[PDB]
Amino acid sequence: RQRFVDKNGRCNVQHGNLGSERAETLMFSEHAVISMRDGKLTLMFRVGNLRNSHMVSAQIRCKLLKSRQTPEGEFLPLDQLELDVGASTGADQLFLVSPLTICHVIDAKSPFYDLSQRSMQTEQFEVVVILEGIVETTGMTCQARTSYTEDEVLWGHRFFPVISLKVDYSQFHATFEVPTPPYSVKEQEEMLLMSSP
């Protein structure tokens, strides 16, 4: 139909109406979710932009903050573990054409491996998001950060779309429930070792 990006490099999608808020509310979604995408239990949250420092492109990374004990019995008050959101594939370099869905595919290398719908109610973690981007007006470096504690990760949810041939920024934070198995990915790989003829 029409391009998303002009040969100029000018982005063609227009926002909706933003309200009078001059506070940075549409940079990250308020909640994260965990549910199936492309056949993989995936931790998800949504990235937008900043109103007063609109960015072209950014690189994003995530850490997980949590207390743990080492096999040596050392207590690590707040330990930092990395959460792959696509460094090895370039998915962590964002082209901020529109609100993006950041995906942390939960696998064996993830700290959410043994995270299940039930284990969630006893876990205490905190996903920190660090985004460093390029203000389009100039090209200087700006950093925006956010946080999801366990009560702001919604197991079994999916984000509403926000796009039409137009970004409906009013649906930016909205999620809804989808059929999502309640077990961890460690459990699901265990069930398939088990159910393998």
From Swiss-Prot:
Associates with KCNJ5/GIRK4 or KCNJ6/GIRK2 or KCNJ9/GIRK3 to form a functional G-protein activated heteromultimer pore-forming unit. Inward rectifier potassium channels are characterized by a greater tendency to allow potassium to flow into the cell rather than out of it. Their voltage dependence is regulated by the concentration of extracellular potassium; as external potassium is raised, the voltage range of the channel opening shifts to more positive voltages. The inward rectification is mainly due to the blockage of outward current by internal magnesium. This potassium channel is controlled by G proteins. This receptor plays a crucial role in regulating the heartbeat. It is found in: Membrane. The chain holds residues 190 to 370 of 501 of the full protein. Residues 22-41 are annotated as: Polyphosphoinositide (PIP2)-binding. It comes from Mus musculus (Mouse). This is G protein-activated inward rectifier potassium channel 1. Belongs to the inward rectifier-type potassium channel (TC 1.A.2.1) family. KCNJ3 subfamily. The gene is Kcnj3.
